[PDB]
Structures are given as C-alpha cells and as structure tokens.
Amino acid sequence: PQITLWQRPIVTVKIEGQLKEALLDTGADDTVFEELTLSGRWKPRLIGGIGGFVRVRQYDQVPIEICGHKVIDTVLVGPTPTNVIGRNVMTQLGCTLNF
Amino acid sequence: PQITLWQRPIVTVKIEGQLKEALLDTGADDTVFEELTLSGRWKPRLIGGIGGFVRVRQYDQVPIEICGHKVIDTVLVGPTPTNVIGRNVMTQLGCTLNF
Numbered sequence A, B: 001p002q003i004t005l006w007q008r009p010i011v012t013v014k015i016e017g018q019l020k021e022a023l024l025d026t027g028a029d030d031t032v033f034e035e036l037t038l039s040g041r042w043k044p045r046l047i048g049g050i051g052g053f054v055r056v057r058q059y060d061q062v063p064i065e066i067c068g069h070k071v072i073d074t075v076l077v078g079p080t081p082t083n084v085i086g087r088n089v090m091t092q093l094g095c096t097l098n099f
C-alpha cells in the first residue's frame, strides 16, 4: 500500500483481541496507546514528547495486526491524546518514506 | 528517494538562511522548530502533543529547502525537544508511506 499524507495516516489495528485506531507516526520511536488492556508483566517507563513527559507501562512481545500483516512488538500504554504506531512496528511493516 | 525507518528519519534543512536538522514526522500536522529565527509577523498558537501543550509562534509562507526541493509553508516556532517536518511540508514533497 501507498499512503499519501493529505490527511492523518490513521490505520485500524487489532491488539490482544481489541480493535483500535492509530496514527502511522515516523516521528515516534515507540508504539503508544492510551486505552489498551494488555496482559502480562510490564515495566514503568517515562517517555518525552512536545508538551512534556508521561509515565507509561512497557509491555513486550505484544501481537499487533496492522495493514494485512501480523507483527509482534513493544507497546507502551499511557496517556497520549492520539494512539501512535512507531518505527518499531513500521520497520516490520517494511514501511518506508518515498518521494 | 526512499527513507527506511531503522533510524530516526532526520534530514537537513535550510530555512531563512539558517541550517538545521529535523525529523520527517508523519504524526505531525505542522512543522515545528525550537531555535529558528524567522522574519515578519506571527500569531500566537498552542499545540498539544504527548505530555501536554506548548505555546508557539505561527509564521506563514516560510520557504524551506529540504530533500532537493524548495517548498514554502507554515512553521511553528517554540519549545520542542526535536525539530519536526510535518505533513504540511511532506505533501508538498510528494512524500508518501510505502509498504
């Protein structure tokens, strides 16, 4: 697929049985969701963005279905105004910036 | 050009005589720089990211040299940990996400 950027590049994901939408975000190192219940152990983490810092839970080896592809990666769960799919997942999608 | 996402997609830009680096950021609606001096008038604006909001100056019709292209767009100037090139500029670059 090719995704133009006239609009926010939002995609539908399925993670641990839950359906969500998220922004394909080349500026995000990590994948981050606000309201997502994930199972298992997690480590406390702080990430920093434009308006300051938020405390998140780091969950590892989380299954994600996105763009006709199933991938497994680290998902951070914490306050964010927008769910974001980070480079960690995009490199696995074989996703590139082309122009 | 094609930019893979194994590393942050940082690019060199020239804006109003000044040389800077910035992240090609599909999750950013707008282009934002921290330490860029721009000429003319501006409007006060607040943008929201992860962690909270920041006050920025909005400058219109700023020429930007990026990726062999000269483009002209709105640049927000304010506190950000990382300069980001937003979709406003990327659409002009003909820049797309491919996988």
Ligand SMILES: CC(C)CN(C[C@@H](O)[C@H](Cc1ccccc1)NC(=O)O[C@H]1CO[C@H]2OCC[C@H]21)S(=O)(=O)c1ccc(N)cc1
Pocket: A025, A026, A027, A028, A029, A030, A031, A032, A047, A048, A049, A050, A080, A081, A082, A084, A086, B023, B025, B026, B027, B028, B029, B030, B031, B032, B047, B048, B049, B050, B082, B084, B086
């Ligand atoms: C500033 C970037 C280097 C990092 N940010 C990713 C970025 O794409 C966010 C992604 C984003 C999107 C919406 C809300 C919060 C964060 N966009 C953003 O802050 O854009 C601002 C400039 O344009 C405006 O348009 C949308 C928000 C404004 S980030 O959200 O802070 C971030 C940081 C670390 C991780 N792992 C994931 C995301």
